[PDB]
Design a protein around this nucleic acid. Structure first.
Lengths: 378, 378
RNA sequence: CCCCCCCCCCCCCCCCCCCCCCCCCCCCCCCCCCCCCCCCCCCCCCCCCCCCCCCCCCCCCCCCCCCCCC
C-alpha cells in the first residue's frame, strides 16, 4: 500500500530528544546572587529610587529587576530553577548591611545589600541621586504623595513590565524590536510614565536586553518567574499588566503556525493547490506535534529551546508561501520580514485574501432557523 | 492462498539483532581522558585562546572540542556512554595543574590540564600564541571587548558547531563534504567569523574529521552529547545554533527514504508501474521498520550502526529508480552521486516530475466550501 | 540553522421576595366443592476384523552501505 510509505520525522525527532538517558549540565560562570523573601522590600525600594530619579543611570536596572524577580521566587525556587535548567550555580546569600560614609562632609547611614553583581558604591550612588531628585521634586511641588515615592510596592513590577515587553521581542534575535518595546511601553504604562520621571523605557529596555544577552540563564529564571507570577490567584493592577504583557510573549517566534491556522479559517483557496496538498501530511504532523507539546511550547523560541526548530513551517515552501500571502492580503503581515520563496503562490493567496474582505455572504445553515421569513424582509 | 507466501526479512533481521543474548565489548586503545564539570571552564578557556589566534594551529582542535563535550557530559555520563557503546575504557581523571617556565628569560605561571592526549607543552604553546595575537589586536584597536576574548562562554560551542557540521557530512564516508561544511560554516556563524580571527572552518573541520577517523568512539560520545545538549530546556544563541546544526544530521545517509516519501506525496505516476508495484510490499516493510525504530534510527549511518543496512532501499532497483527520477525532475537531487539502475523508469519519473511543476489545479474538495460562488469570479 | 508583524485587560444595567391553601371523611373479615396413589410388558448380549508395506537427505546465484541541499 502506497499510503504506508510515511516517515514521522517530527515525532521521531521529538522522541529522540525526549528519551535521552544522558544529561549535560553547564556552568553559569560567576556566582549567582540569589536573594530570598527577606530582601524583597529592599530590592523594591532600590527599584523605586531608580524610578523617581530623572535622567537615571539605568546601567544596572536589568540586574536589579532580575534580583527582584529572584527575591519573589525565593532562594529555593530560584536554585531549583537553575538546577532544572541544567546549570552549575554557586548561590550567594543576599543580606542587608549598613554602611556609613562621609559625603558632603557629613556622617550619614546607608542601608545596602551584599551582592557580588552590584557593588556597594553603586547602590549608594543610586540612593544619593534618588535623594537629590526627591528633594528637587518636593521643592517644585510642595508635598509628595504615595504616587511619587520609592515606597510604592509596584516599583519593581513596573520595571518587570518593561522586561516583559523585551521578552516579547526577544525572538527577533537582536535589539530590533526596541522601537516596538518603546511604543508599547508608552501606550501601556502611560500613567506610570507621568508618575515616575526616571521611567525611561529605552534605557530600561536596553539594560534588560544587555542582561539577557550576557546571562542566558536569566531568561530562564525570568520566564519561570513570569509563569509563577501569572499562576497566582490575584494581585494589583500593575501585576495584572505584567501578566498581560508576559502572555503577549506566548508563541513568540512561531507566528507562521498561527497564520496557517488563520489561512485555514478564512478558507483560502490556494490551500487546495497541488503542491500545498503534497506538503499537507507533514504540515499536519507539525501541528499535531505543537498541540502535543501544549503550553510549554509557547516559550521555546524565547528560551532558545533546541526543539524550537521542530515547530518551523519554512521547510514547506508552498504552504508557507500560501500562508504568507493570506496574511499579506488580509493586511496583518505588517513589516514581517520573512520572505515567501514561491512568488506565484504568494501572489495568488494575497489576491484571494484581498477578495475575501470585499465579498461575504451570510450562511443561514449555521443557525437554528426553523422558519426563514428573512426572504420577505430583503 | 498465494497472499500468504511472504517473508518479512527486514523484521526478521531486526528481531535477530535485537534479541542477541551474547555481547561483545571492545578495547578503545589508549586511556580515555574523561574530564568532569570541574575543568569545563578551563577547556572553554583553551577553546577561546584557540579562537582568538589568527593562523591558529588547529591540529588539536578536534581533541579539545571532544574534551569540552565530555566535560559538559561529565565523567559519569561519559563513562556510562562508553560502557553502553560496548568499550573497555581506562578513564583518566583530568585536573588542573600549575607550570612555571622561563620563556623570554622571564618566570611566568601557566595553568594547564593533566591530559594524556594533549601534552603540557602544547597547551603552553596555545596560550603563548593566543597572548601574542591578543596583544597585537589590542595594539591595533586600542581596547578589547567581551566579544574578542577567550572568556566568552560560547567559545567551546562554536567549535562544537563546526563539529556538528562535520557530523552532518560524515555519512558520505570520507572528507568529501568538506566544501559543504566550509560553505555552511560561512553562512551560519558569519558574525562569529568576523569576531574570531582564528575561526578557520577548514582547519577545524579537518581536525574533527581526523579525530573522528582515529577514534570511532568519539563519534558515539559526540552524538550522545548532542542529543543531551538538544534535550535541555534552553540556552544561549550559540547553543541553539548547535542544536539546529545537529538536527541537520538526523536522517543522514538515508535520503532515499525521504525522497520516496516525497515521490509518494507528489503522486508520481511511475509508482504505479508493474515492477514498482511488485516491490511495494518489501519497500513498505522497510518503511514500517524505520518508523518502528523511530528516533534512534536517524543517526544509524553517522554512528556506523550495523542495522543501517536494513534501512536501504537500493535493493529495490525499480522503486529506487522512480524515486531518484522524481527527485531529479523536481530539481532537488542536486549533485547526489547515487545512480539509477533502471534508466527507463528514471527517465519517465523525471519527465512526469518536470510536468508536475508547470501544471497544477486547485482541488476545492479539500476545503469546507459549502457554497462555491468561485465559478462566477473566474 | 531557526527567527523576524501587531497587540495588555476592562468599561452597561441590575438585590431577592410578594397569591391562595392543613389533611381526612364510603363500604367491606376470610372461608365453604370434590378428590389418596398405584395397577401392563420387558434382563443384556450374539457378526467380522491386528497393524504395516513406496520413494526420498539438504544445499548450490548475485550482492556491503552511503553519497544532495539546508
Amino acid at each position: 500500500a502506497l499510503s504506508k510509505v510515511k516517515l514521522n520525522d517530527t515525532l521521531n525527532k521529538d522522541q529522540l530528544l525526549s528519551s535521552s538517558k544522558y544529561t549535560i549540565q553547564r556552568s553559569t560562570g560567576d556566582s549567582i546572587d540569589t536573594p530570598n523573601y527577606d530582601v524583597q522590600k529592599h530590592i523594591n525600594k532600590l527599584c523605586g529610587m531608580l524610578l523617581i530619579t530623572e535622567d537615571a543611570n539605568h546601567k544596572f536596572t536589568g540586574l536589579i529587576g532580575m534580583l527582584y524577580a529572584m527575591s519573589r521566587l525565593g532562594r529555593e525556587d530560584t536554585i531549583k530553577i537553575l538546577r532544572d535548567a541544567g546549570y552549575h550555580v554557586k548561590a550567594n546569600g543576599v543580606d542587608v548591611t549598613t554602611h556609613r560614609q562621609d559625603i558632603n562632609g557629613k556622617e550619614m547611614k546607608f542601608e545596602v545589600l551584599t551582592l557580588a553583581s552590584l557593588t556597594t558604591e553603586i547602590q549608594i550612588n543610586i540612593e544619593i541621586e534618588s535623594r537629590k531628585s526627591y528633594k528637587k521634586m518636593l521643592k517644585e511641588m510642595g508635598e509628595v504623595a504615595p504616587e511619587y515615592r520609592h515606597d510604592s510596592p509596584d516599583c519593581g513590577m513596573i520595571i518587570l513590565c518593561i522586561a516583559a515587553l523585551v521578552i516579547t521581542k526577544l525572538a527577533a534575535g537582536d535589539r530590533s524590536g526596541l522601537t516596538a518595546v518603546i511604543r508599547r511601553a508608552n501606550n501601556v504604562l502611560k500613567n506610570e510614565m507621568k508618575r515616575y520621571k526616571g521611567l525611561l523605557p529605552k534605557d530600561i529596555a536596553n539594560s534588560f536586553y544587555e542582561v539577557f544577552e550576557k546571562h542566558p540563564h536569566f531568561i530562564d529564571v525570568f520566564v519561570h518567574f513570569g509563569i509563577a507570577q501569572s499562576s497566582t490567584r490575584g494581585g494589583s493592577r500593575v501585576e495584572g499588566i505584567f501578566a498581560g504583557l508576559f502572555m503577549n510573549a506566548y508563541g513568540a517566534g512561531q507566528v507562521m503556525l498561527r497564520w496557517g491556522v488563520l489561512a485555514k479559517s478564512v478558507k483560502n483557496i490556494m490551500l487546495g493547490h497541488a503542491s500545498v496538498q503534497a506538503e499537507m501530511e507533514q504540515v499536519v504532523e507539525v501541528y499535531e506535534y505543537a498541540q502535543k507539546l501544549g503550553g510549554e511550547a509557547g516559550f521555546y523560541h524565547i528560551l532558545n529551546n533546541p526543539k524550537a526548530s521542530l515547530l518551523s513551517l519554512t521547510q514547506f515552501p508552498h504552504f508557507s508561501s500560501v500562508v504568507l500571502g493570506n496574511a499579506a492580503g488580509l493586511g496583518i503581515m505588517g513589516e514581517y520580514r520573512g520572505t515567501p520563496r514561491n512568488q506565484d503562490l504568494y501572489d495568488a493567496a494575497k489576491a484571494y485574501a484581498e477578495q475575501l474582505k470585499e465579498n461575504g455572504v451570510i450562511n443561514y445553515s449555521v443557525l437554528d432557523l426553523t422558519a426563514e421569513e428573512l426572504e420577505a424582509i430583503k
